[PDB]
Amino acid sequence: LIVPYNLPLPGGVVPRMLITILGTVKPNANRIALDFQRGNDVAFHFNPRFNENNRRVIVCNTKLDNNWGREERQSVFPFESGKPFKIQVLVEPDHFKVAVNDAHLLQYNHRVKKLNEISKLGISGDIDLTSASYTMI
Numbered sequence: 403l404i405v406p407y408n409l410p411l412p413g414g415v416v417p418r419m420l421i422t423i424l425g426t427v428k429p430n431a432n433r434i435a436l437d438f439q440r441g442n443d444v445a446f447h448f449n450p451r452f453n454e455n456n457r458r459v460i461v462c463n464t465k466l467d468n469n470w471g472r473e474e475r476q477s478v479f480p481f482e483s484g485k486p487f488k489i490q491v492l493v494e495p496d497h498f499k500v501a502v503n504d505a506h507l508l509q510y511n512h513r514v515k516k517l518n519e520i521s522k523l524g525i526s527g528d529i530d531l532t533s534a535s536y537t538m539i
């Protein structure tokens with residue numbers, strides 16, 4: 403698949419929806435980004451950074467009216483340059499739950515409450531993208 407990739411989420415997200423992203427991190431990767439969009443707003447931005455001041459960190463945030471909010475940062479970093487990965491985002495009633503390579507990584511409390519209007523997922527960054535899909539569990 404071509405990156406950046408736009409995956410429509412028809413009718414928005416709903417609890418029990420599972421989004422699975424398969425790809426490979428490029429050897430000299432700097433960033434990965436998943437952007438769950440509500441129009442121009444970003445309900446949930448998931449942003450692994452491979453070199454923020456020579457540390458690897460995951461930054462999560464929400465963008466409202468073109469303004470970023472308070473960042474939530476996770477120092478646990480399961481990605482590795484050059485290696486294949488699986489990201490799974492499970493929508494639960496109160497949070498997005500993210501697992502990488504079948505291991506729980508983090509939860510992100512819903513700041514954007516109109517889940518049915520979060521209708522696009524943008525996938526970008528230094529990856530080869532193999533598959534992006536969703537299903538109901």
Ligand SMILES: OC[C@H]1O[C@@H](O[C@H]2[C@H](O)[C@@H](O)[C@H](O)O[C@@H]2CO)[C@H](O)[C@@H](O)[C@H]1O
Pocket residue numbers: 447449461462463470473
């Ligand atoms: O919060 C997600 C958002 O971060 C922006 O970068 C921030 C950076 O994380 C922060 O340390 C600095 O003080 O401000 C920057 C600008 O708000 C990224 O530019 C953006 O792409 C998102 O990743």
Ligand SMILES: [Cl-]
Pocket residue numbers: 513514515516
């Ligand atoms: Cl809202």
